[PDB]
Amino acid sequence: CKQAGESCDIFSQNCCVGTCAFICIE
16 A cells, blocks of 8 residues: 555556556555
8 A cells, every 4th residue: 555656566556546557646
């Protein structure tokens, strides 16, 4: 789980419920 703007990978998403293709928006 991560806040929108926090680091994130494509296959490895940091947003539990947020699209993280190339960025986390949760």
